[PDB]
Amino acid sequence: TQRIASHSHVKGLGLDESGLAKQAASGLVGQENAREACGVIVELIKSKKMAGRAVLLAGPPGTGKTALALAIAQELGSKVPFCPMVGSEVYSTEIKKTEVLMENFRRAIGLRIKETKEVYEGEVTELTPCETENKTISHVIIGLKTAKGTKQLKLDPSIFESLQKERVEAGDVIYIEANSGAVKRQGRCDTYATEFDLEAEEYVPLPKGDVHKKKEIIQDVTLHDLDVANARPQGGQDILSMMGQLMKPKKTEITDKLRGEINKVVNKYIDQGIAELVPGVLFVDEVHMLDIECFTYLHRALESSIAPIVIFASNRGNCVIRGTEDITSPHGIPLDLLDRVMIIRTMLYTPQEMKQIIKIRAQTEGINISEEALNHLGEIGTKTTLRYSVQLLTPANLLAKINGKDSIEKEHVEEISELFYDAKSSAKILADQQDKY
Amino acid sequence: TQRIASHSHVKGLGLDESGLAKQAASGLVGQENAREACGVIVELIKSKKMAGRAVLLAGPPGTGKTALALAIAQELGSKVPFCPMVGSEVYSTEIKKTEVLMENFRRAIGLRIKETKEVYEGEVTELTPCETENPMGGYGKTISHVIIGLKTAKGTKQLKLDPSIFESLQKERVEAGDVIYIEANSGAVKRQGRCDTYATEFDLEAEEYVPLPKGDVHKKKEIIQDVTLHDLDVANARPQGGQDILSMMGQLMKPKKTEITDKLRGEINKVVNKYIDQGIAELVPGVLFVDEVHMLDIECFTYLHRALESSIAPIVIFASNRGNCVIRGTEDITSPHGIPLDLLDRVMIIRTMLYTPQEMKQIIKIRAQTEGINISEEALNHLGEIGTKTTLRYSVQLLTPANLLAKINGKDSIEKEHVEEISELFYDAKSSAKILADQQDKY
Amino acid sequence: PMVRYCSGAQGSTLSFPPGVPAPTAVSQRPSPSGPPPRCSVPGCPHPRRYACSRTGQALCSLQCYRINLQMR
Amino acid sequence: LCSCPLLKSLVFSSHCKAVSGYSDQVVHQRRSATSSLRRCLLTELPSFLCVASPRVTAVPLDSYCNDRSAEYERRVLKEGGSLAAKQCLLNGAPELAAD
Amino acid sequence: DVTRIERIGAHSHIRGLGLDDALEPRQASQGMVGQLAARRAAGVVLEMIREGKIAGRAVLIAGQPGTGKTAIAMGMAQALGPDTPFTAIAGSEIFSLEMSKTEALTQAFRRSIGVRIKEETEIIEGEVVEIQIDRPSKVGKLTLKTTEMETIYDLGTKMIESLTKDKVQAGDVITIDKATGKISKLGRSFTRARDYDAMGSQTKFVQCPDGELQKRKEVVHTVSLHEIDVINSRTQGFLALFSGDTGEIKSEVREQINAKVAEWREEGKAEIIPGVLFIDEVHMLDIESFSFLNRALESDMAPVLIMATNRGITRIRGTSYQSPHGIPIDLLDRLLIVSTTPYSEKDTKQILRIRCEEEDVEMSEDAYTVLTRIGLETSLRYAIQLITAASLVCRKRKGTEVQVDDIKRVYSLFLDESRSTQYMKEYQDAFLFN
Amino acid sequence: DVTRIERIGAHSHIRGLGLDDALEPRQASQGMVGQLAARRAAGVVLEMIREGKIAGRAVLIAGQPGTGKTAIAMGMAQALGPDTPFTAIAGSEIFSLEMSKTEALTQAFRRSIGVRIKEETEIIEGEVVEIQIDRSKVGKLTLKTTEMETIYDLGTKMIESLTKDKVQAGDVITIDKATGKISKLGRSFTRARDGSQTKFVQCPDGELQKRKEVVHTVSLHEIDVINSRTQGFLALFSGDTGEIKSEVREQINAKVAEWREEGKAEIIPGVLFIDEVHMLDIESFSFLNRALESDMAPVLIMATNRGITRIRGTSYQSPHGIPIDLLDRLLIVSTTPYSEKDTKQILRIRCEEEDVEMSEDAYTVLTRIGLETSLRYAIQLITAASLVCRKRKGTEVQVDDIKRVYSLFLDESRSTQYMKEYQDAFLFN
Numbered sequence A: 001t002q003r004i005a006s007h008s009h010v011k012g013l014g015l016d017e018s019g020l021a022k023q024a025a026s027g028l029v030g031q032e033n034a035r036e037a038c039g040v041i042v043e044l045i046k047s048k049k050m051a052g053r054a055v056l057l058a059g060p061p062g063t064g065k066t067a068l069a070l071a072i073a074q075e076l077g078s079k080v081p082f083c084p085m086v087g088s089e090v091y092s093t094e095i096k097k098t099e100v101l102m103e104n105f106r107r108a109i110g111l112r113i114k115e116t117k118e119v120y121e122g123e124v125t126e127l128t129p130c131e132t133e134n135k136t137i138s139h140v141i142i143g144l145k146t147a148k149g150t151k152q153l154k155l156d157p158s159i160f161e162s163l164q165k166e167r168v169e170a171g172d173v174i175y176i177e178a179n180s181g182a183v184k185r186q187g188r189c190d191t192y193a194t195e196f197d198l199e200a201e202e203y204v205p206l207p208k209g210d211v212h213k214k215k216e217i218i219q220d221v222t223l224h225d226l227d228v229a230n231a232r233p234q235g236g237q238d239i240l241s242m243m244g245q246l247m248k249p250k251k252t253e254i255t256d257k258l259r260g261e262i263n264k265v266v267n268k269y270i271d272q273g274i275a276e277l278v279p280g281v282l283f284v285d286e287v288h289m290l291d292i293e294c295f296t297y298l299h300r301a302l303e304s305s306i307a308p309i310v311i312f313a314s315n316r317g318n319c320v321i322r323g324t325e326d327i328t329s330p331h332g333i334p335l336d337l338l339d340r341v342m343i344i345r346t347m348l349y350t351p352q353e354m355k356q357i358i359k360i361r362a363q364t365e366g367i368n369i370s371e372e373a374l375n376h377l378g379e380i381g382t383k384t385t386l387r388y389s390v391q392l393l394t395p396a397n398l399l400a401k402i403n404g405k406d407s408i409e410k411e412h413v414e415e416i417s418e419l420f421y422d423a424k425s426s427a428k429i430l431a432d433q434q435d436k437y
Numbered sequence B: 001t002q003r004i005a006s007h008s009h010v011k012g013l014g015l016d017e018s019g020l021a022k023q024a025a026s027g028l029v030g031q032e033n034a035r036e037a038c039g040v041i042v043e044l045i046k047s048k049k050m051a052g053r054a055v056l057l058a059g060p061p062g063t064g065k066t067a068l069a070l071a072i073a074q075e076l077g078s079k080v081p082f083c084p085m086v087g088s089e090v091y092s093t094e095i096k097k098t099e100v101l102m103e104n105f106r107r108a109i110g111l112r113i114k115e116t117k118e119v120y121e122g123e124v125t126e127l128t129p130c131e132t133e134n135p136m137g138g139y140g141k142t143i144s145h146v147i148i149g150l151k152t153a154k155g156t157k158q159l160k161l162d163p164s165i166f167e168s169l170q171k172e173r174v175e176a177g178d179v180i181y182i183e184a185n186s187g188a189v190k191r192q193g194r195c196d197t198y199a200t201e202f203d204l205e206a207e208e209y210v211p212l213p214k215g216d217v218h219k220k221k222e223i224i225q226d227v228t229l230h231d232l233d234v235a236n237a238r239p240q241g242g243q244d245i246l247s248m249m250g251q252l253m254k255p256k257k258t259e260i261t262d263k264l265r266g267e268i269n270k271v272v273n274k275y276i277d278q279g280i281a282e283l284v285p286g287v288l289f290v291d292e293v294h295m296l297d298i299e300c301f302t303y304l305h306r307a308l309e310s311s312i313a314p315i316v317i318f319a320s321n322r323g324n325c326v327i328r329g330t331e332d333i334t335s336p337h338g339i340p341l342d343l344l345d346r347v348m349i350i351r352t353m354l355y356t357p358q359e360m361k362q363i364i365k366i367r368a369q370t371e372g373i374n375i376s377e378e379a380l381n382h383l384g385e386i387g388t389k390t391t392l393r394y395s396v397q398l399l400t401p402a403n404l405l406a407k408i409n410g411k412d413s414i415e416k417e418h419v420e421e422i423s424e425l426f427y428d429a430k431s432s433a434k435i436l437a438d439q440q441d442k443y
Numbered sequence C: 001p002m003v004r005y006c007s008g009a010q011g012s013t014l015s016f017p018p019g020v021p022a023p024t025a026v027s028q029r030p031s032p033s034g035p036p037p038r039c040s041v042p043g044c045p046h047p048r049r050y051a052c053s054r055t056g057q058a059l060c061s062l063q064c065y066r067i068n069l070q071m072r
Numbered sequence D: 001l002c003s004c005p006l007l008k009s010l011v012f013s014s015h016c017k018a019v020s021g022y023s024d025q026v027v028h029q030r031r032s033a034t035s036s037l038r039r040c041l042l043t044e045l046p047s048f049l050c051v052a053s054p055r056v057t058a059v060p061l062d063s064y065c066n067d068r069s070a071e072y073e074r075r076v077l078k079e080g081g082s083l084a085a086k087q088c089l090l091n092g093a094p095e096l097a098a099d
Numbered sequence E: 001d002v003t004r005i006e007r008i009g010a011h012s013h014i015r016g017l018g019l020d021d022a023l024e025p026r027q028a029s030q031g032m033v034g035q036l037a038a039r040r041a042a043g044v045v046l047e048m049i050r051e052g053k054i055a056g057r058a059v060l061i062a063g064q065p066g067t068g069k070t071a072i073a074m075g076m077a078q079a080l081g082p083d084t085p086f087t088a089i090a091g092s093e094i095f096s097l098e099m100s101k102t103e104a105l106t107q108a109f110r111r112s113i114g115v116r117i118k119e120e121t122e123i124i125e126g127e128v129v130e131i132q133i134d135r136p137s138k139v140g141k142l143t144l145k146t147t148e149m150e151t152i153y154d155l156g157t158k159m160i161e162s163l164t165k166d167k168v169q170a171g172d173v174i175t176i177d178k179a180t181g182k183i184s185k186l187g188r189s190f191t192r193a194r195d196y197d198a199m200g201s202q203t204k205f206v207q208c209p210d211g212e213l214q215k216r217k218e219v220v221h222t223v224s225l226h227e228i229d230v231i232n233s234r235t236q237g238f239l240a241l242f243s244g245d246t247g248e249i250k251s252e253v254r255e256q257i258n259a260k261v262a263e264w265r266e267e268g269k270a271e272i273i274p275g276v277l278f279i280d281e282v283h284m285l286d287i288e289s290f291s292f293l294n295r296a297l298e299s300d301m302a303p304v305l306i307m308a309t310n311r312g313i314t315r316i317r318g319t320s321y322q323s324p325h326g327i328p329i330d331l332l333d334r335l336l337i338v339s340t341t342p343y344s345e346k347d348t349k350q351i352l353r354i355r356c357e358e359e360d361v362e363m364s365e366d367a368y369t370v371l372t373r374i375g376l377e378t379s380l381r382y383a384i385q386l387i388t389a390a391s392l393v394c395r396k397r398k399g400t401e402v403q404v405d406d407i408k409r410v411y412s413l414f415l416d417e418s419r420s421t422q423y424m425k426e427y428q429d430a431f432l433f434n
Numbered sequence F: 001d002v003t004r005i006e007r008i009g010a011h012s013h014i015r016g017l018g019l020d021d022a023l024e025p026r027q028a029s030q031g032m033v034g035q036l037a038a039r040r041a042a043g044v045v046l047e048m049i050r051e052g053k054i055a056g057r058a059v060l061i062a063g064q065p066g067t068g069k070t071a072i073a074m075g076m077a078q079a080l081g082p083d084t085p086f087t088a089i090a091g092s093e094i095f096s097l098e099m100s101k102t103e104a105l106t107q108a109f110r111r112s113i114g115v116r117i118k119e120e121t122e123i124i125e126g127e128v129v130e131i132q133i134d135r136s137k138v139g140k141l142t143l144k145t146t147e148m149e150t151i152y153d154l155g156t157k158m159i160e161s162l163t164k165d166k167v168q169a170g171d172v173i174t175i176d177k178a179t180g181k182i183s184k185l186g187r188s189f190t191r192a193r194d195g196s197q198t199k200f201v202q203c204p205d206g207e208l209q210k211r212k213e214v215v216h217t218v219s220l221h222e223i224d225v226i227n228s229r230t231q232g233f234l235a236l237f238s239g240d241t242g243e244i245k246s247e248v249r250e251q252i253n254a255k256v257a258e259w260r261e262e263g264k265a266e267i268i269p270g271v272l273f274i275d276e277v278h279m280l281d282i283e284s285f286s287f288l289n290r291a292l293e294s295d296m297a298p299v300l301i302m303a304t305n306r307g308i309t310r311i312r313g314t315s316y317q318s319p320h321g322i323p324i325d326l327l328d329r330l331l332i333v334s335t336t337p338y339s340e341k342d343t344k345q346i347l348r349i350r351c352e353e354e355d356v357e358m359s360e361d362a363y364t365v366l367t368r369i370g371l372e373t374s375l376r377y378a379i380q381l382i383t384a385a386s387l388v389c390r391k392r393k394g395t396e397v398q399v400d401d402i403k404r405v406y407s408l409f410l411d412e413s414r415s416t417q418y419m420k421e422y423q424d425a426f427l428f429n
Ligand SMILES: Nc1ncnc2c1ncn2[C@@H]1O[C@H](COP(=O)(O)OP(=O)(O)O)[C@@H](O)[C@H]1O
Pocket: A006, A007, A010, A027, A028, A029, A030, A031, A059, A060, A061, A062, A063, A064, A065, A066, A067, A315, A357
């Protein structure tokens, strides 16, 4: 089955129709003000009429900021593209640090495109090139045989170059498209498999239906994928496109002229109405790790009119800005960007609310825990941390499977908590032996 | 002849039969403890029982630990490989430090594979399409085999080959008298060139003339080729065959050191294990040497832990001329000898001490006899006083200009006036350092 | 009209139809010329380096070329 | 490496096809229908791989000029380039194209 | 006398964790001794990995230098089994000038997870009788012989191109795949190759096969997610795997590979198995890789990982503030800490006794007193090296039993780090950069 | 109803820059309110660039954070007018591993300047009634327009171009008499009867064959890339081009100077714009001086929000985050903060731009929020307030809903106050 994930049990924000936050819903408890605050945010993203908005999440580590981000990601649905990003990902040797942040917007915004394609496919009965004086091939003559009928068509020397590229021979089934110009080969027909007792080529049955068929194909592509396709000529029918296809795909920066041309052609597609554009959501975790230069570019980036909504996550308080060497700023974010972003306050969980999280996670892991072990795990959790009691669930279940008990017991929790060490106790032990370290 | 090298006078450790180190052996005097310790180290290398062993050599500058480490390879011989590497080569722009150390670990170990070869070579006297008689109604003509003649100075031989090779002989240019290479095992046929005998008929010809091979027509000889695991890793890293367009263009591109994944290392270990199980290939371990180890980065120091804990790690020797110093990469961290305590605990430290003035005089005499220079008694005493005053190295450097100037003056031997004039003209490092203090304001 | 290569366990055989031409022709090296070419002025003679059209005779060097041109 | 068949087998890596050393030895079970695991250095398995493909593909840009000669250079550049270079890339050499 | 590529090593003698079915630690088993707490915890993580129902978990090991923190990881590595993937990486290895550290981390996480795929193929194996080819498309026949049955098959165009490309002639035992199309020549027959042409090529000989000619075989393989991502990212990049030139792979391709692998798991043709990622001396890793590791571990495909920390209360590289174990509180609190108790005097004698059976060196009873005292005053690693060199000098004296005088000889030859520091203090003024 | 690529931003609420013939700014014009002196100076700069008789002059904009000088800069860019070169870059964008900082800044100075060249070419366009081809190959076609009807004969190359792209009966196309590329614009309504049916275009009017003058503006960096690389379109669009030699650039400068001496073409100075210049390296800071001292240089404007701050790369504290060498090279225009009376006007015009209906109590309380806190925070409050009003189903925003949004989102100062209480629990305080 599916591997259990830490955030897998979170199905969303768990909000009612009035916008208020229920006590326990969608696998989330507490943070009523945060969830109720996000209830307007999901209505903004679903409204789509506003852009260039950034919402910062401020809270202690382990308070579910990332759970709120992924909860919004699950609340908006699968149609709304959601792009996670970490502050350490923007550093790359191939491209500049700014190009990553600029490409994350095109990768955030999604686009739905409907493409009408005309298809010519079937068995090839005869293929011959024409000969014209300059010994050059001006035209190609290829007949097509199908169960419905036979029709002879003429092809261009480029399509013939793709056929000879695919090693197409008489008696094989091929796939030909017009607008794209690419040529595919399905394989040899099954009727000829009897002449050879042993053959390397696999056989496919003869397809059915008319040779020429026009069909609509709805595909979802991202403006970053379009931006890379227009950036480098990886695909194509050109021999240089084949050589570049053999070359290594290193990352390169995209010019603002190409970006503006993309805005032009996509704007024309919107004016035609064939393409449907949907806004994306860009998530940034560990924003305090981002450089002051990345924030400097984020000034113009967030002020951009086409920028999708960006959510930030800050788990730290006042800290020195990266690269400044002197000035320290609240939440690791300088006052310039911090003035623009919208801050959401997150509060620590209460001792009563922690036990419910321990119970929900214990049920998610598939473990049966008695009320005594639940109260003990809650007690030690409030003594140290929630993450510790969350991590103590599985090993105690393992000891239960070893001893044969159907449920966890106070001796199992006591033995597991005896084996594992808390960060506070370990940090206290490091003081006595610190001289030996 | 061979240019004289500073360490060229060290031919080995010069160990005795009982394991004790003779006082003067192989041009090495003193350092009995170090010579005996290295005497056990070479026994570990020959024994090959352990791997990943790291030895450390510490001491003042000029104590001869480099002469002992280089003497290890001379005592072991040319059978086992020896790879000296300075710590300065670890830092590189294209290739990362960990890949440098790994490629050195693959450079130390090496293999030897014995192979037999059968080759037919010589001038072509005749080529005949031998036709057996088997007329058939389905197909008219039949050709059983093709006869290829070969002529050499030792003897002539004719060969009966299948007609399938005549398709290649007709595919590429073959003329009467062409010296060609034909291997029986591979079966391929190559054209070496035209014979030198026919070069007299034309004043100008485009074809080059290779001489006829001297020897028997059929040459079967067994040769043992030695290939290191690093060479195997490079050949497995990039394709040698240029038949592909990507191999031709990539061959046109500038070669750069590439990071090799561990999967290829594992495959090499597996196939090497197979050939060792077959017994055809002989595996010998290498000896890795490292000088100026205090110059390594802390990341390299921590990487050497996981590198040494592996069973494929060859024996590594270290040389450190520095005392307690700050560890490179960290400002406030100080560790003895310039190495962290973690690796310093794993390495085996060997202490070295400075020579006495008598040993200085003896080493000076050894270098004099090596360079072929004669020294008078009193001048040797004064030179020993100079070396004791400053260093042994400077007193060694003072030998050449006194020899050249002595030959210029006409005296075949060095004199106290010669070493006095040389010592007057040239300045020792400490004296120059003291002179720099007075004029330092003008500098 | 198709050439037939038949390789059996007892031996190999390459058979051709009467329609296709014979690909094979017996080729043997001719007898080499015994005497080497020699220089024009016969106190010199060496293998000829070049031929001279005006004198119609082969010479190795311009030295002997002067004697040949003077004699002609 | 070509003169020795063993040294040639010592290097399995080739840019043309995939290689894997998964199966070191062969274990055969003899019956009316026999099953024997593969061995040595030869493994490919191209079928399952490569299913992933890019979503969109673009055609390289072209220049449009107001004279005829630039249309000549454009048709030559786009169609064949150089003849010996085109055949030299397809077959790898012109003499490999005639060959 | 034959020496493999593997040689004796510090952690190489461990054959496993030495655990019972109850997972309770045994005092001495599978080459490991002592430290019942960390042995039991290692049993918990081994049983957890063998369960494989939970993903995205991190286990940390801390303790004093010389407590066997690496010996435990090698114990679970050897006790995990060959069929389960295991990966051991170092913090300095993921640092590279070609690719980014975070990309190397993704290669580690996707590298640890193994994928097992089974393949059933019908191949033809037999001895060739005759080979015939007709060239005008070339059409020829192939006659094969086996002891059970003799067969005759027809060859196609691609088949003749493959055989002629492989230089196959009559009298060779070959293996042909119908579906794949590959041909591999195993060798030649003794009797069929006894009479050969005057060329006289001697290479190899293989006996004639028996049974059915065409048989069905099952060959199972394992492919890494990083391997598939490199192959499909480089567009026929099979050489880039061993070359290592690939880097900075796009994330969209990785996402599509994850979705396609999930679809394969839904189909059941391919299976996914968990794997272990071992990291030693993680305290030197940059804090950026920690911030990326905390959020990157939340993925469903993120395997469980195990880290080791030698020291504690030390500032992180790139930051001026100290933190416990050189790790931020987010990660340190994000994973569980397992402390290793330092070894005692009673266990040291047994650890030194393991080398007697491992290295096959007979040790006298009087050598364990002085050797054990050296193990108490100095490092157990120096004690093991003292055992090895002590056995070397013992062989030099040609004795079967170890003598104390030989151990005194090795102790006179090699000095401890503290002693080298003591002499380095006397000669330190002459040393450089004191 | 369809969502365009552009959406309402901070600078998008204003269009153009309101000015007068006497250069006296109105209180509210072109969406902008206040800053009479700033709009007057920016208007003087705009008239200078519109004059374009000089080159190599710099002017700096200074003001407190939140004064909207970036908004007046983008509004000045909108009021600049079409068909004029303009470039907008940031101080942090010039840093790249692919290209050097000097080559990137110089590349920006190249993209800013541009050249206008006018040509004339003969192009045929119209509806094609019939096409006949006989296979050399000889064929004739009919080109019909509303005014006149014509028949044409084709050569070998024209027959090849016709057989390349098949054209049916009565299709409106454009045939170029120079290159030979035939492009089909559309299909006639009556002729397209009796297919894909992609588009329909009416029959063209006017003369069939006309000589059109093409006005085409090219960029110096564009020409430089085209000349340097084999294919400058693949170089520029691919982004692989970098570190272009200065000798080729100098030769191109000399050739453009020769073009201006010939008078066949003209050069149009561009407007460079730099954002967040408070943090920048002294290499670029020093290079701007010589780049402006060059013969042909575009007119640039730079924005610096911060005050006196230490520059990057040195320990010296420069005034306005810029060294005195660059400060003395340009003129500075300072902007004053917005008045309380103008705050509610900005809020009202943002209600008109964002289509939000609020009350006078809403404008009053939000004006208090503008007094105690920056206006940007209020502009961020109203946007989330409209949605809460939609959830309340009311047709007008209420102060209670504004209190709900104000309870949902907190100011940076408030988050700092709570972060002072929880700061000890936070990491690395
Ligand atoms: N309100 C909540 N209800 C249920 N589970 C929660 C809640 N908040 C956090 N969690 C769980 O706690 C775990 C750790 O949270 P974490 O991501 O560390 O929070 P933060 O991102 O604020 O540091 C998450 O896997 C999440 O599922």
